[PDB]
């Protein structure tokens, strides 16, 4: 209910099962990932831009991030 | 996120793929995951969770199916003990039945044992045998309802498929 409407996991599990983890990761996982992917997203954008030019960059090929 | 436990062993780790050298005592969680925790814990690690759940269920059914083989051979031996007098029972039993009895023995079937100790290859062979049986019974739609749950439309479509298959097989030249 009102106490446990802040996270889709029960309060006991939140209190004990998350030891030494960032509350950003626990509560806003998508923002945490997209923030840690800041440079990788720019590299992927550059890779796409060069691919549209016919220049396939092999180095940044694995960087295909969906979330 | 998966973590890890700090390691105490002072042993070098050499990775040819990444051309890096690491010490076991100094590894982060990801390095431990990719180096120390990279081993396998099931017969078929190349399968997904759903695929390996199906594999495990088929393996259990295969163990029970080999036990069913042994039980059926025992029941046929009991039948021979009644329909055939002792004056000629052992000859007819040594014809074919005794060989199958020794085939379905302690190592080849789990029986009453706690664990049927199979390698991953043996488990895969048992599961493939179960899948062959499933294929040959499903091609005729025998799974419904004992071994399958199908809706009414699925049952009707399967009946039509089996009817066409039966006609095609009946109208084939004999070998």
């Amino acid at each position: 209910g009102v106490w446990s409407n802040i996270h889709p996991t029960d309060k006991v599990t939140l209190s004990f099962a998350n030891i030494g983890r960032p509350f950003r990761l626990i509560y806003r996982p998508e923002i945490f990932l997209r923030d840690q992917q800041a440079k990788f997203i720019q590299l992927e954008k550059e890779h796409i831009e060069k691919s549209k030019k016919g220049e396939f960059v092999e180095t940044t090929s694995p960087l295909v991030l969906w979330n | 996120a998966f973590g890890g436990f700090r390691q105490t062993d002072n042993s070098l780790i050499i990775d040819d793929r990444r051309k890096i050298i690491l010490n076991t005592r100094s590894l982060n969680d990801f390095q431990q995951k990719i180096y120390l925790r990279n081993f396998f814990t099931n017969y078929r690690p190349d399968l997904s969770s759903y695929d390996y759940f199906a594999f495990k269920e088929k393996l259990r059914i295969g163990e029970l199916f080999l036990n069913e083989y042994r039980k059926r051979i025992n029941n046929e031996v009991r039948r021979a003990a009644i329909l055939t007098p002792t004056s000629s029972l052992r000859e007819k039993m040594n014809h074919k039945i005794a060989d199958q009895i020794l085939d379905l023995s302690s190592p080849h079937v789990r029986g009453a044992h706690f664990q049927a100790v199979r390698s991953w290859t043996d488990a895969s062979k048992i599961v493939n045998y179960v899948e062959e049986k499933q294929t040959k019974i499903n091609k005729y739609g025998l799974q419904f309802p004992l071994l399958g749950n199908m809706t009414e439309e699925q049952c009707a479509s399967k009946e039509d498929e089996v009817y066409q298959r039966l006609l095609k097989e009946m109208q084939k030249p004999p070998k």
Binding site: - | D16, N38, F39, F40, T41, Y43, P45, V117, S119, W120
Partner: protein
């Protein structure tokens, strides 16, 4: 059981390959004092002309090789079939 499971790794030993060169390369950093002594011996021997035959750098080389192979020999042996430590001891 673990023995009934597939193996997740394939080392050079398990592939029938010799890791001796790589292990030598990765054990050379363990022994740099001896390598520097050997280099100094070679430099001094090249410095003078027609030195006494009882003046060789084979002994510094022996020290360096002993130090290096003290690192490469056991490790590879630990990866060989039939080198298991035993059931109890």
């Amino acid at each position: 059981s673990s023995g009934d499971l597939p193996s997740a790794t394939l080392s050079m030993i398990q592939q029938g390959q010799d890791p001796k060169e790589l292990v030598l390369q990765h054990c050379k950093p363990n022994c740099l004092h001896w390598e520097q002594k050997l280099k100094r011996c070679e430099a001094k021997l090249r410095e003078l002309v027609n030195a006494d035959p009882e003046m060789s750098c084979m002994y510094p080389l022996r020290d360096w090789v002993t130090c290096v192979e003290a690192c490469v020999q056991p490790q590879i042996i630990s990866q060989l079939v039939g080198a298991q430590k035993g059931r109890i001891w």
